[PDB]
Design an enzyme around this catalytic site. Structure first.
Site, PDB file in Angstrom:
ATOM      1  N   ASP A 169      69.093  10.768 -11.290  1.00 16.86           N
ATOM      2  CA  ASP A 169      68.036  10.576 -11.927  1.00 16.86           C
ATOM      3  C   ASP A 169      67.578  11.513 -12.992  1.00 16.86           C
ATOM      4  OD1 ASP A 169      64.535  10.127 -11.156  1.00 16.86           O
ATOM      5  OD2 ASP A 169      65.567   9.548 -12.802  1.00 16.86           O
ATOM      6  N   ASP A 192      66.294   7.979 -19.287  1.00 14.55           N
ATOM      7  CA  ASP A 192      66.001   8.133 -17.930  1.00 14.55           C
ATOM      8  C   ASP A 192      67.195   7.003 -17.237  1.00 14.55           C
ATOM      9  OD1 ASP A 192      64.852   8.039 -15.301  1.00 14.55           O
ATOM     10  OD2 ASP A 192      62.757   7.504 -16.020  1.00 14.55           O
TER      11      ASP A 192
HETATM   12  C1  LIG Z   1      61.036   3.396 -11.388  1.00 16.32           C
HETATM   13  C2  LIG Z   1      61.053   4.896 -10.792  1.00 16.32           C
HETATM   14  O1  LIG Z   1      59.957   5.365 -10.420  1.00 16.32           O
HETATM   15  N1  LIG Z   1      62.059   5.535 -11.277  1.00 16.32           N
HETATM   16  C3  LIG Z   1      62.255   7.153 -10.965  1.00 16.32           C
HETATM   17  C4  LIG Z   1      63.241   7.576 -10.137  1.00 16.32           C
HETATM   18  C5  LIG Z   1      63.139   6.160  -8.771  1.00 16.32           C
HETATM   19  C6  LIG Z   1      64.103   5.434  -8.746  1.00 16.32           C
HETATM   20  C7  LIG Z   1      63.941   4.375  -7.503  1.00 16.32           C
HETATM   21  F1  LIG Z   1      64.929   3.339  -7.372  1.00 16.32           F
HETATM   22  C8  LIG Z   1      62.662   4.453  -6.430  1.00 16.32           C
HETATM   23  C9  LIG Z   1      61.932   5.677  -6.941  1.00 16.32           C
HETATM   24  F2  LIG Z   1      60.951   5.884  -5.956  1.00 16.32           F
HETATM   25  C10 LIG Z   1      61.985   6.664  -7.653  1.00 16.32           C
HETATM   26  C11 LIG Z   1      62.338   7.931 -12.139  1.00 16.32           C
HETATM   27  O2  LIG Z   1      62.273   9.306 -11.802  1.00 16.32           O
HETATM   28  C12 LIG Z   1      60.930   7.719 -12.952  1.00 16.32           C
HETATM   29  N2  LIG Z   1      60.930   8.516 -14.098  1.00 16.32           N
HETATM   30  C13 LIG Z   1      59.707   8.653 -14.883  1.00 16.32           C
HETATM   31  C14 LIG Z   1      58.558   9.439 -14.087  1.00 16.32           C
HETATM   32  C15 LIG Z   1      57.455   8.496 -13.446  1.00 16.32           C
HETATM   33  C16 LIG Z   1      56.361   9.150 -12.723  1.00 16.32           C
HETATM   34  C17 LIG Z   1      56.934  10.477 -12.123  1.00 16.32           C
HETATM   35  C18 LIG Z   1      58.050  11.082 -12.558  1.00 16.32           C
HETATM   36  N3  LIG Z   1      58.137  12.394 -12.176  1.00 16.32           N
HETATM   37  C19 LIG Z   1      58.258  12.414 -10.656  1.00 16.32           C
HETATM   38  C20 LIG Z   1      58.628  14.177 -10.830  1.00 16.32           C
HETATM   39  C21 LIG Z   1      58.710  14.340 -12.330  1.00 16.32           C
HETATM   40  N4  LIG Z   1      58.690  13.501 -13.025  1.00 16.32           N
HETATM   41  C22 LIG Z   1      58.901  10.566 -13.305  1.00 16.32           C
HETATM   42  C23 LIG Z   1      59.874   9.667 -16.276  1.00 16.32           C
HETATM   43  C24 LIG Z   1      58.636   9.841 -17.108  1.00 16.32           C
HETATM   44  C25 LIG Z   1      58.158   8.243 -17.715  1.00 16.32           C
HETATM   45  C26 LIG Z   1      58.396   7.160 -16.597  1.00 16.32           C
HETATM   46  C27 LIG Z   1      59.426   7.478 -15.477  1.00 16.32           C
END
Ligand SMILES: CC(=O)N[C@@H](Cc1cc(F)cc(F)c1)[C@H](O)CNC1(c2cccc(-n3cccn3)c2)CCCCC1
Ligand SMILES: [Zn+2]
Ligand SMILES: [Zn+2]
Ligand SMILES: [Zn+2]
Ligand SMILES: [Zn+2]
Length: 388
Positions: free
Chosen positions: A36, A222
């Site tokens: 990620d 991402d």
């Molecule tokens: C769909 C999903 O959620 N994917 C996870 C990865 C992922 C994949 C999956 F298959 C299941 C999941 F629960 C999470 C990925 O980081 C999401 N990344 C963002 C995001 C959104 C909300 C919080 C955080 N974040 C948290 C800590 C620092 N940043 C990051 C980055 C900013 C813009 C939108 C998406």
């Protein structure tokens, strides 16, 4: 850990993230870990769960140390809770080095783990700034570079419900993974892998928006998100323009919402009626930019005698997210040492009959720093001190 030992070290199911094999603890516990670029925490399943059949057993690892600290991390729909510690971490189809890193042992979760994923954890490869519970929790990649002689750089070639393959090159660039030239856009600030989009075209036609609307409130690369996501206003302009070119087909609204497949008879999909999408990224030279061109094969995802498709572009309220949809076109260089992101066309050519996925430039214009948005500074963020 020649680059050749890293070629093809990724796997996944379509629309469910790409994973690399890691080991954790002593003796090593093997686990499959989602790569990620959109987060900064290294976390692994560490207790029984419905969708898991292996997890991190802290008590079986002789090199484990408790940090006596809990941590909570929400994502877009999923979330987990964890207890922090450190242990020895290796990537077996990676460089030949072992490092002590921070691991969040996940004890409870909601909608985090995905039935069939085959992954038991998540490698946040973005910067310390967005690490939880704060930026003093060194991310994995930081540790790996600090503790060893590995160059401060990695590359992703994402390829291909159905199975996916690909490569994470830790510490350099493998020229067998790309063709043509590599174009670099600057990393605007080291938190997410934030970039600036200066122009968007759908089938060569400019969307003609204030270029700040494209990076509102940001634009990022991402690997953790499936879709290309687009700020509400850009999403609406974009769908209008995609509907207009594909208008010989009349889909139900649910399809444009990404909540419904559409089907043609085996091997007869009319690719030609769906437009290419060009995203122009800021170049390293002021007033220069270069485009990455996306085929409907990238944004129309495969899911009787029928080929069926999900629309993999969706609305955002947290800016432009260049997800796997976008990355699958490309060998993508996360050149942390030089604060740049490179794109080139992938040697896994997911290619059309008359069109191809492309990385092209220069294109020369005016005023791209003007395309950045500055996020409103909250009291909570302003107040935390940073003695790092
Ligand atoms: C769909 C999903 O959620 N994917 C996870 C990865 C992922 C994949 C999956 F298959 C299941 C999941 F629960 C999470 C990925 O980081 C999401 N990344 C963002 C995001 C959104 C909300 C919080 C955080 N974040 C948290 C800590 C620092 N940043 C990051 C980055 C900013 C813009 C939108 C998406
Ligand atoms: Zn292996
Ligand atoms: Zn709990
Ligand atoms: Zn202080
Ligand atoms: Zn700090």
């Amino acid at each position: 850990g020649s680059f050749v030992e890293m070629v093809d070290n990724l796997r996944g199911k379509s629309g469910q993230g790409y994973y690399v094999e890691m080991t954790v603890g002593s003796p090593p516990q093997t686990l499959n870990i989602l790569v990620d670029t959109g987060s900064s925490n290294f976390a692994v399943g560490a207790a029984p769960h419905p969708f898991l059949h292996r997890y991190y057993q802290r008590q079986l690892s002789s090199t484990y140390r408790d940090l006596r600290k809990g941590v909570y991390v929400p994502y877009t729909q999923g979330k987990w809770e964890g207890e922090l510690g450190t242990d020895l971490v290796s990537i077996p189809h990676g460089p030949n080095v072992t490092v002590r890193a921070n691991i969040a042992a996940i004890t409870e979760s909601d909608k985090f783990f995905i039935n069939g994923s085959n992954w038991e954890g998540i490698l946040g490869l973005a910067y310390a700034e967005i690490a939880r519970p704060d930026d003093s929790l060194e991310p994995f990649f930081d540790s790996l570079v600090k503790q060893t002689h590995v160059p401060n750089l990695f590359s992703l070639q994402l390829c291909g419900l159905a199975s996916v393959g690909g490569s994470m090159i830790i510490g350099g660039i493998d020229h067998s993974l790309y063709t043509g030239s590599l174009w670099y856009t600057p990393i605007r600030r080291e938190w997410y892998y934030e970039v600036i989009i200066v122009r968007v075209e759908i089938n060569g036609q400019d969307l003609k928006m204030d270029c700040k609307e494209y990076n509102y409130d940001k634009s990022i690369v991402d690997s953790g998100t499936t879709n290309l996501r687009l700020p509400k206003k850009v999403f609406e302009a974009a769908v209008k323009s995609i509907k207009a070119a594909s208008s010989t087909e009349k889909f139900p609204d649910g399809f444009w919402l990404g909540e419904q497949l559409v089907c043609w008879q085996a091997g007869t999909t009319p690719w030609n009626i769906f437009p290419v999408i060009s995203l122009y990224l800021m170049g390293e030279v002021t007033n220069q930019s270069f485009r990455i061109t996306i085929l409907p094969q990238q944004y129309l995802r495969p899911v009787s005698q029928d080929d069926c498709y999900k629309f993999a572009i969706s609305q955002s309220s947290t800016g432009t997210v260049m997800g796997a949809v976008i990355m699958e076109g490309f060998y993508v260089v996360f050149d942390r040492a030089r604060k740049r992101i490179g794109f080139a066309v992938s040697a896994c050519h997911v290619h059309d009959e008359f069109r191809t996925a492309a990385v092209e430039g220069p294109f020369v214009t005016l005023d791209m720093e003007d395309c950045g948005y500055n996020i409103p500074q909250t009291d909570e963020s302003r107040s935390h001190h940073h003695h790092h």
